[PDB]
PDB file of C-alpha atoms in Angstrom:
ATOM      1  CA  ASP A  30       0.096  -0.045   0.069  1.00  0.00           C
ATOM      2  CA  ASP A  31       1.113   3.588   0.464  1.00  0.00           C
ATOM      3  CA  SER A  32       3.027   2.227   3.576  1.00  0.00           C
ATOM      4  CA  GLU A  33       5.715   0.671   1.331  1.00  0.00           C
ATOM      5  CA  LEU A  34       6.369   4.037  -0.316  1.00  0.00           C
ATOM      6  CA  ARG A  35       6.796   5.760   3.187  1.00  0.00           C
ATOM      7  CA  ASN A  36       9.159   2.934   4.234  1.00  0.00           C
ATOM      8  CA  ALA A  37      11.051   3.503   1.018  1.00  0.00           C
ATOM      9  CA  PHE A  38      11.259   7.072   1.607  1.00  0.00           C
ATOM     10  CA  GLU A  39      12.709   6.608   5.182  1.00  0.00           C
ATOM     11  CA  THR A  40      15.416   4.385   3.570  1.00  0.00           C
ATOM     12  CA  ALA A  41      16.258   7.041   1.162  1.00  0.00           C
ATOM     13  CA  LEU A  42      16.424   9.506   3.897  1.00  0.00           C
ATOM     14  CA  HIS A  43      18.630   7.417   5.886  1.00  0.00           C
ATOM     15  CA  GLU A  44      21.201   7.087   2.830  1.00  0.00           C
ATOM     16  CA  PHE A  45      20.915  10.591   2.472  1.00  0.00           C
ATOM     17  CA  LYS A  46      22.241  11.500   6.044  1.00  0.00           C
ATOM     18  CA  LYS A  47      24.599   8.706   5.835  1.00  0.00           C
ATOM     19  CA  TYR A  48      26.056  10.381   2.778  1.00  0.00           C
ATOM     20  CA  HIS A  49      26.478  13.866   4.535  1.00  0.00           C
ATOM     21  CA  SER A  50      28.197  12.283   7.504  1.00  0.00           C
ATOM     22  CA  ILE A  51      30.812  11.033   5.041  1.00  0.00           C
ATOM     23  CA  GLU A  52      31.083  14.671   3.685  1.00  0.00           C
ATOM     24  CA  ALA A  53      31.571  15.855   7.060  1.00  0.00           C
ATOM     25  CA  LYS A  54      34.165  13.114   7.771  1.00  0.00           C
ATOM     26  CA  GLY A  55      36.005  14.516   4.631  1.00  0.00           C
ATOM     27  CA  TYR A  56      35.851  18.161   5.776  1.00  0.00           C
ATOM     28  CA  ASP A  57      37.374  16.980   9.108  1.00  0.00           C
ATOM     29  CA  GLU A  58      40.427  15.173   7.693  1.00  0.00           C
ATOM     30  CA  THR A  59      40.959  18.404   5.428  1.00  0.00           C
ATOM     31  CA  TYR A  60      41.187  20.542   8.506  1.00  0.00           C
ATOM     32  CA  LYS A  61      43.590  18.290  10.254  1.00  0.00           C
ATOM     33  CA  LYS A  62      45.952  18.311   7.218  1.00  0.00           C
ATOM     34  CA  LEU A  63      45.670  22.138   7.342  1.00  0.00           C
ATOM     35  CA  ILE A  64      47.010  22.124  10.735  1.00  0.00           C
ATOM     36  CA  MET A  65      49.711  19.722  10.435  1.00  0.00           C
ATOM     37  CA  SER A  66      50.962  21.560   7.203  1.00  0.00           C
ATOM     38  CA  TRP A  67      51.353  24.725   9.130  1.00  0.00           C
ATOM     39  CA  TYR A  68      53.063  22.787  11.754  1.00  0.00           C
ATOM     40  CA  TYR A  69      55.608  21.387   9.516  1.00  0.00           C
ATOM     41  CA  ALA A  70      56.218  24.693   7.636  1.00  0.00           C
ATOM     42  CA  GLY A  71      57.148  26.299  11.121  1.00  0.00           C
ATOM     43  CA  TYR A  72      59.419  23.222  11.907  1.00  0.00           C
ATOM     44  CA  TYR A  73      61.439  23.292   8.857  1.00  0.00           C
ATOM     45  CA  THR A  74      61.520  27.157   8.907  1.00  0.00           C
ATOM     46  CA  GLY A  75      62.732  27.077  12.300  1.00  0.00           C
ATOM     47  CA  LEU A  76      65.147  24.402  11.777  1.00  0.00           C
ATOM     48  CA  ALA A  77      66.915  26.078   8.879  1.00  0.00           C
ATOM     49  CA  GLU A  78      67.146  29.330  10.783  1.00  0.00           C
ATOM     50  CA  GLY A  79      68.932  27.343  13.631  1.00  0.00           C
ATOM     51  CA  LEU A  80      71.303  25.740  11.380  1.00  0.00           C
ATOM     52  CA  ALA A  81      72.434  29.093   9.996  1.00  0.00           C
ATOM     53  CA  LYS A  82      73.446  30.589  13.412  1.00  0.00           C
ATOM     54  CA  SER A  83      76.212  27.984  13.386  1.00  0.00           C
TER      55      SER A  83
ATOM     56  CA  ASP B  12      18.130  65.703   4.037  1.00  0.00           C
ATOM     57  CA  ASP B  13      17.098  62.181   3.202  1.00  0.00           C
ATOM     58  CA  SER B  14      20.723  61.204   2.597  1.00  0.00           C
ATOM     59  CA  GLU B  15      21.590  61.992   6.270  1.00  0.00           C
ATOM     60  CA  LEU B  16      18.754  59.881   7.779  1.00  0.00           C
ATOM     61  CA  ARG B  17      19.021  57.177   5.204  1.00  0.00           C
ATOM     62  CA  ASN B  18      22.705  56.457   6.100  1.00  0.00           C
ATOM     63  CA  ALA B  19      21.623  56.231   9.803  1.00  0.00           C
ATOM     64  CA  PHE B  20      19.514  53.292   8.836  1.00  0.00           C
ATOM     65  CA  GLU B  21      22.294  51.420   6.728  1.00  0.00           C
ATOM     66  CA  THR B  22      24.648  52.279   9.569  1.00  0.00           C
ATOM     67  CA  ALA B  23      22.503  50.894  12.145  1.00  0.00           C
ATOM     68  CA  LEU B  24      21.480  47.881   9.937  1.00  0.00           C
ATOM     69  CA  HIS B  25      25.346  47.238   9.778  1.00  0.00           C
ATOM     70  CA  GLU B  26      26.099  47.005  13.543  1.00  0.00           C
ATOM     71  CA  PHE B  27      23.113  44.693  14.002  1.00  0.00           C
ATOM     72  CA  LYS B  28      24.321  42.382  11.100  1.00  0.00           C
ATOM     73  CA  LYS B  29      27.757  42.153  13.076  1.00  0.00           C
ATOM     74  CA  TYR B  30      25.804  41.334  16.265  1.00  0.00           C
ATOM     75  CA  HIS B  31      23.911  38.616  14.660  1.00  0.00           C
ATOM     76  CA  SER B  32      27.084  37.012  13.639  1.00  0.00           C
ATOM     77  CA  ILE B  33      29.494  37.280  16.559  1.00  0.00           C
ATOM     78  CA  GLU B  34      29.439  33.649  17.406  1.00  0.00           C
ATOM     79  CA  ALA B  35      30.508  32.597  13.865  1.00  0.00           C
ATOM     80  CA  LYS B  36      33.200  35.254  13.954  1.00  0.00           C
ATOM     81  CA  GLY B  37      34.301  33.771  17.142  1.00  0.00           C
ATOM     82  CA  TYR B  38      34.786  30.292  15.901  1.00  0.00           C
ATOM     83  CA  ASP B  39      36.456  31.914  13.033  1.00  0.00           C
ATOM     84  CA  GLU B  40      39.109  33.666  15.213  1.00  0.00           C
ATOM     85  CA  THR B  41      39.395  30.519  17.475  1.00  0.00           C
ATOM     86  CA  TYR B  42      40.593  28.469  14.264  1.00  0.00           C
ATOM     87  CA  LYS B  43      42.872  31.360  13.202  1.00  0.00           C
ATOM     88  CA  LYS B  44      44.555  31.167  16.497  1.00  0.00           C
ATOM     89  CA  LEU B  45      44.711  27.293  16.402  1.00  0.00           C
ATOM     90  CA  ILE B  46      46.640  27.534  13.162  1.00  0.00           C
ATOM     91  CA  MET B  47      48.985  30.176  14.330  1.00  0.00           C
ATOM     92  CA  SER B  48      49.544  28.103  17.441  1.00  0.00           C
ATOM     93  CA  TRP B  49      50.767  25.086  15.723  1.00  0.00           C
ATOM     94  CA  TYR B  50      52.930  27.091  13.275  1.00  0.00           C
ATOM     95  CA  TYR B  51      54.664  28.388  16.310  1.00  0.00           C
ATOM     96  CA  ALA B  52      55.115  25.180  18.264  1.00  0.00           C
ATOM     97  CA  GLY B  53      56.815  23.935  15.015  1.00  0.00           C
ATOM     98  CA  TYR B  54      58.920  27.078  14.590  1.00  0.00           C
ATOM     99  CA  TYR B  55      60.323  27.008  17.989  1.00  0.00           C
ATOM    100  CA  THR B  56      60.822  23.138  18.088  1.00  0.00           C
ATOM    101  CA  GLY B  57      62.853  23.431  14.868  1.00  0.00           C
ATOM    102  CA  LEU B  58      64.908  26.348  15.844  1.00  0.00           C
ATOM    103  CA  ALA B  59      66.090  24.578  19.199  1.00  0.00           C
ATOM    104  CA  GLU B  60      66.866  21.612  17.265  1.00  0.00           C
ATOM    105  CA  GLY B  61      68.779  23.700  14.735  1.00  0.00           C
ATOM    106  CA  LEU B  62      70.735  25.642  17.456  1.00  0.00           C
ATOM    107  CA  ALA B  63      71.644  22.176  19.338  1.00  0.00           C
ATOM    108  CA  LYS B  64      73.408  21.122  16.226  1.00  0.00           C
ATOM    109  CA  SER B  65      76.666  23.112  16.402  1.00  0.00           C
TER     110      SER B  65
ATOM    111  CA  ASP C  27      90.647 -11.117 -13.552  1.00  0.00           C
ATOM    112  CA  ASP C  28      91.776  -7.399 -12.899  1.00  0.00           C
ATOM    113  CA  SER C  29      88.223  -6.335 -14.096  1.00  0.00           C
ATOM    114  CA  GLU C  30      86.831  -7.920 -10.825  1.00  0.00           C
ATOM    115  CA  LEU C  31      89.282  -6.593  -8.401  1.00  0.00           C
ATOM    116  CA  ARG C  32      89.256  -3.028 -10.122  1.00  0.00           C
ATOM    117  CA  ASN C  33      85.468  -2.639  -9.781  1.00  0.00           C
ATOM    118  CA  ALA C  34      85.847  -3.369  -6.190  1.00  0.00           C
ATOM    119  CA  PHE C  35      88.037  -0.331  -5.811  1.00  0.00           C
ATOM    120  CA  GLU C  36      85.700   2.064  -7.667  1.00  0.00           C
ATOM    121  CA  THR C  37      82.720   0.482  -5.804  1.00  0.00           C
ATOM    122  CA  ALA C  38      84.273   1.162  -2.275  1.00  0.00           C
ATOM    123  CA  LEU C  39      85.579   4.400  -3.522  1.00  0.00           C
ATOM    124  CA  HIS C  40      81.935   5.247  -4.458  1.00  0.00           C
ATOM    125  CA  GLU C  41      80.530   4.579  -0.943  1.00  0.00           C
ATOM    126  CA  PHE C  42      83.125   6.512   0.816  1.00  0.00           C
ATOM    127  CA  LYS C  43      82.404   9.513  -1.572  1.00  0.00           C
ATOM    128  CA  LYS C  44      78.773   9.321  -0.162  1.00  0.00           C
ATOM    129  CA  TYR C  45      80.018   9.139   3.248  1.00  0.00           C
ATOM    130  CA  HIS C  46      82.149  12.264   2.953  1.00  0.00           C
ATOM    131  CA  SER C  47      79.219  14.333   1.709  1.00  0.00           C
ATOM    132  CA  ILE C  48      76.206  13.141   4.050  1.00  0.00           C
ATOM    133  CA  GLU C  49      76.109  16.392   5.809  1.00  0.00           C
ATOM    134  CA  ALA C  50      75.823  18.458   2.579  1.00  0.00           C
ATOM    135  CA  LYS C  51      73.122  15.899   1.510  1.00  0.00           C
ATOM    136  CA  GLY C  52      71.365  16.601   4.676  1.00  0.00           C
ATOM    137  CA  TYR C  53      71.171  20.378   4.228  1.00  0.00           C
ATOM    138  CA  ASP C  54      69.804  19.672   0.708  1.00  0.00           C
ATOM    139  CA  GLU C  55      67.119  17.226   1.867  1.00  0.00           C
ATOM    140  CA  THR C  56      66.242  19.817   4.684  1.00  0.00           C
ATOM    141  CA  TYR C  57      65.649  22.445   2.055  1.00  0.00           C
ATOM    142  CA  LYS C  58      63.587  20.388  -0.111  1.00  0.00           C
ATOM    143  CA  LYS C  59      61.260  19.389   2.676  1.00  0.00           C
ATOM    144  CA  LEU C  60      61.087  23.213   3.726  1.00  0.00           C
ATOM    145  CA  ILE C  61      59.910  24.170   0.156  1.00  0.00           C
ATOM    146  CA  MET C  62      57.126  21.189   0.012  1.00  0.00           C
ATOM    147  CA  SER C  63      55.998  22.202   3.537  1.00  0.00           C
ATOM    148  CA  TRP C  64      55.333  25.903   2.468  1.00  0.00           C
ATOM    149  CA  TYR C  65      53.658  24.747  -0.877  1.00  0.00           C
ATOM    150  CA  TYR C  66      51.376  22.495   1.264  1.00  0.00           C
ATOM    151  CA  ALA C  67      50.604  24.999   3.871  1.00  0.00           C
ATOM    152  CA  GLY C  68      49.335  27.033   0.946  1.00  0.00           C
ATOM    153  CA  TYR C  69      47.589  24.453  -0.647  1.00  0.00           C
ATOM    154  CA  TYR C  70      45.473  23.615   2.428  1.00  0.00           C
ATOM    155  CA  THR C  71      44.830  27.104   3.343  1.00  0.00           C
ATOM    156  CA  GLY C  72      43.630  27.873  -0.200  1.00  0.00           C
ATOM    157  CA  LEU C  73      41.530  24.789  -0.293  1.00  0.00           C
ATOM    158  CA  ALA C  74      39.748  25.756   3.026  1.00  0.00           C
ATOM    159  CA  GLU C  75      39.062  29.145   1.713  1.00  0.00           C
ATOM    160  CA  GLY C  76      37.577  27.851  -1.480  1.00  0.00           C
ATOM    161  CA  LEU C  77      35.322  25.411   0.233  1.00  0.00           C
ATOM    162  CA  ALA C  78      34.185  27.894   2.586  1.00  0.00           C
ATOM    163  CA  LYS C  79      32.898  30.076  -0.381  1.00  0.00           C
ATOM    164  CA  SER C  80      29.660  28.008  -1.421  1.00  0.00           C
TER     165      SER C  80
ATOM    166  CA  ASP D  20     107.371  52.725   4.107  1.00  0.00           C
ATOM    167  CA  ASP D  21     106.258  49.165   3.397  1.00  0.00           C
ATOM    168  CA  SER D  22     103.668  49.891   6.159  1.00  0.00           C
ATOM    169  CA  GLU D  23     101.590  51.997   4.029  1.00  0.00           C
ATOM    170  CA  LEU D  24     101.212  48.917   1.597  1.00  0.00           C
ATOM    171  CA  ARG D  25     100.236  46.691   4.348  1.00  0.00           C
ATOM    172  CA  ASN D  26      97.746  48.953   5.553  1.00  0.00           C
ATOM    173  CA  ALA D  27      96.409  49.633   1.912  1.00  0.00           C
ATOM    174  CA  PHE D  28      96.122  45.695   1.613  1.00  0.00           C
ATOM    175  CA  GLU D  29      94.023  45.324   4.759  1.00  0.00           C
ATOM    176  CA  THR D  30      91.599  48.126   3.469  1.00  0.00           C
ATOM    177  CA  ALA D  31      91.391  46.147   0.174  1.00  0.00           C
ATOM    178  CA  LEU D  32      90.755  43.136   1.977  1.00  0.00           C
ATOM    179  CA  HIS D  33      88.069  44.712   4.112  1.00  0.00           C
ATOM    180  CA  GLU D  34      86.388  45.735   0.849  1.00  0.00           C
ATOM    181  CA  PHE D  35      86.700  42.230  -0.537  1.00  0.00           C
ATOM    182  CA  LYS D  36      84.848  40.527   2.416  1.00  0.00           C
ATOM    183  CA  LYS D  37      82.381  43.420   2.492  1.00  0.00           C
ATOM    184  CA  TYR D  38      81.644  42.590  -1.116  1.00  0.00           C
ATOM    185  CA  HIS D  39      80.966  38.909  -0.444  1.00  0.00           C
ATOM    186  CA  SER D  40      78.879  39.718   2.507  1.00  0.00           C
ATOM    187  CA  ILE D  41      76.484  41.498   0.030  1.00  0.00           C
ATOM    188  CA  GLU D  42      76.662  38.582  -2.278  1.00  0.00           C
ATOM    189  CA  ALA D  43      75.576  36.286   0.572  1.00  0.00           C
ATOM    190  CA  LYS D  44      72.802  38.755   1.365  1.00  0.00           C
ATOM    191  CA  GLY D  45      71.589  38.472  -2.489  1.00  0.00           C
ATOM    192  CA  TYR D  46      71.407  34.533  -2.239  1.00  0.00           C
ATOM    193  CA  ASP D  47      69.400  34.777   0.893  1.00  0.00           C
ATOM    194  CA  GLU D  48      66.742  36.922  -0.599  1.00  0.00           C
ATOM    195  CA  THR D  49      66.723  34.680  -3.494  1.00  0.00           C
ATOM    196  CA  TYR D  50      65.876  31.667  -1.591  1.00  0.00           C
ATOM    197  CA  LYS D  51      62.960  33.470   0.465  1.00  0.00           C
ATOM    198  CA  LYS D  52      61.328  34.486  -2.935  1.00  0.00           C
ATOM    199  CA  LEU D  53      61.746  30.715  -3.696  1.00  0.00           C
ATOM    200  CA  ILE D  54      59.882  29.687  -0.659  1.00  0.00           C
ATOM    201  CA  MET D  55      57.094  32.385  -0.987  1.00  0.00           C
ATOM    202  CA  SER D  56      56.515  31.271  -4.602  1.00  0.00           C
ATOM    203  CA  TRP D  57      55.894  27.809  -3.833  1.00  0.00           C
ATOM    204  CA  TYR D  58      53.533  29.090  -0.958  1.00  0.00           C
ATOM    205  CA  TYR D  59      51.496  31.114  -3.482  1.00  0.00           C
ATOM    206  CA  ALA D  60      51.399  28.347  -6.207  1.00  0.00           C
ATOM    207  CA  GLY D  61      50.012  25.937  -3.449  1.00  0.00           C
ATOM    208  CA  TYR D  62      47.538  28.677  -2.277  1.00  0.00           C
ATOM    209  CA  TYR D  63      46.061  29.477  -5.611  1.00  0.00           C
ATOM    210  CA  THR D  64      46.019  25.719  -6.693  1.00  0.00           C
ATOM    211  CA  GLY D  65      44.101  24.964  -3.514  1.00  0.00           C
ATOM    212  CA  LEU D  66      41.730  27.974  -3.833  1.00  0.00           C
ATOM    213  CA  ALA D  67      40.786  27.039  -7.383  1.00  0.00           C
ATOM    214  CA  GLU D  68      40.209  23.353  -6.584  1.00  0.00           C
ATOM    215  CA  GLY D  69      37.942  24.634  -3.536  1.00  0.00           C
ATOM    216  CA  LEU D  70      35.929  26.777  -5.663  1.00  0.00           C
ATOM    217  CA  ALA D  71      35.210  23.920  -8.151  1.00  0.00           C
ATOM    218  CA  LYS D  72      33.673  21.682  -5.437  1.00  0.00           C
ATOM    219  CA  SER D  73      30.748  24.077  -5.506  1.00  0.00           C
TER     220      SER D  73
END
């Protein structure tokens, strides 16, 4: 009956939210690489400056 | 004339747009400081390692 | 004959040339990582700004 | 006497080292532009990629 369509809709709704949660996961890993990249840029910057004072 | 009183509306309308988005601005500043902090942790870690080698 | 023993000299002479210039090679690798690090800091900074605009 | 020549030589020696210190200054600024250029190449690369995901 019309119950099968409503059940199908909740399924498609579950897949929709499951998809955006993956999208959010991707944005999270992106911002972690952003932070590490700034850490290493500072590290090799400081390291070169330190070797020069030799 | 109208120009004086009209700007007083856009002026007030401006400060109220700021107020409505102070939290979002706070998250933004929080993440800028996060990024600068990790840069600097890296900087001073690399510097110290570079000075030690001499 | 001579070919076998002669190559053993150039072979050993090679590894010892490497040893004599490991520090200079270290400075070189340090500066390659410095360059890649700043590229990546820029990459992820620009990406995040580009995603935010949507 | 021969003291004037030795004094003249130390002067010319001072100018010689003062010149190479400028040369070293030029090599330094060159490597800073090298690093910034890689930063901006990454930045505009990331930024374009970010706008595309729109």
